[PDB]
Specification:
- This protein has a single domain (about 1-60), classed as 2-Layer Sandwich (Defensin A-like), CATH 3.30.30.10.
- The protein is of the alpha+beta class.
- It has a 3-stranded antiparallel β-sheet, with helices on one face.
- Helices cover about 15% and strands about 20% of the residues.
- The protein is built from 1 helix and 3 strands.
- The termini are far apart.
- Belongs to the long (4 C-C) scorpion toxin superfamily. Sodium channel inhibitor family.
- One of its GO terms (biological process) is defense response to fungus.
- One of its GO terms (cellular component) is extracellular region.
- Its main location: secreted.
- GO terms for molecular function: sodium channel inhibitor activity; toxin activity.
Length: about 60
């Protein structure tokens, strides 16, 4: 599964002025296989199906 990671508040995880590879790391902590800064937010590939990703409809940010 792919999508934007969220923080604890339901906001997309920002990658404004982060080092390169930040989003790949954060995606990997959630067991994703790849990620990148889809500026301004981290986007992941290869997440297991149980991982919650951002959804605009239900956003709480």
């Amino acid at each position: 599964k792919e999508g934007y990671l969220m923080d604890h508040e339901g906001c997309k995880l920002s990658c404004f002025i982060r080092p390169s590879g930040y989003c790949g790391r954060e995606c990997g902590i959630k067991k994703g296989s790849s990620g990148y800064c889809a500026w301004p937010a981290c986007y992941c590939y290869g997440l297991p199906n149980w991982v919650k990703v951002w959804d605009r409809a239900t956003n709480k940010c």
